[PDB]
Amino acid sequence: LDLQKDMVVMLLSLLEGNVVNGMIARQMVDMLVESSSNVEMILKFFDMFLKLKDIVGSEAFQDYVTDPRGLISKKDFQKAMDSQKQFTGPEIQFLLSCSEADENEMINCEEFANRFQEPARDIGFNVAVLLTNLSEHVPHDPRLR
Amino acid sequence: QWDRLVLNTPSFPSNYWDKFVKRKVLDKHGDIFGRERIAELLGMDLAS
Known part of the structure; x- marks a missing residue:
């Protein structure tokens, strides 16, 4: 993720001094469209983990949590996410795979939510800055939308 | 605080x-x- 942040800083340095509808900005948008699927995967990673941090604090998720220890079983986690309806089936399966459940199939919800918040904050902010810069310097481009 | 009373009343949106x-x-x-x-x-009654 730090390497990603460095690459995005390089892209922003390329965008430095760019006029609206600039050639380098248009080339960057073309590169993003060429790598659309991977860009979408990265954005989905960030979105899923931010939404997880939001959901784990939710009252419905806390209700689905019942273990006095504070952990939640894999089945309870799946049912809570299904009820939230804010994730898809494959996304819930990926979250379960990353949950790092113990031999008893119990997930530490707090640790799972907080694992990726700090490591991915810098790259997330840099990606947001890159997208905002490109959007404002290339206003009329449907692909960036 | 006073508006909490009317939330669960059956006739909430009367006017x-x-x-x-x-x-x-x-x-x-x-x-x-x-x-x-x-x-x-x-x-509210979900079955209703």
Whole structure:
């Protein structure tokens, strides 16, 4: 993720001094469209983990949590996410795979939510800055939308 | 604080035109905050 942040800083340095509808900005948008699927995967990673941090604090998720220890079983986690309806089936399966459940199939919800918040904050902010810069310097481009 | 009294009353939107505000709120906030708890807050009967 730090390497990603460095690459995005390089892209922003390329965008430095760019006029609206600039050639380098248009080339960057073309590169993003060429790598659309991977860009979408990265954005989905960030979105899923931010939404997880939001959901784990939710009252419905806390209700689905019942273990006095504070952990939640894999089945309870799946049912809570299904009820939230804010994730898809494959996304819930990926979250379960990353949950790092113990031999008893119990997930530490707090640790799972907080694992990726700090490591991915810098790259997330840099990606947001890159997208905002490109959007404002290339206003009329449907692909960036 | 006073408005808490009217939330679960059956005739909440008596003068207001939107008679489906309760269901709109349930649909909007039913997933994060819990459908059963929203129904309890708004005096709603899901089977009805």
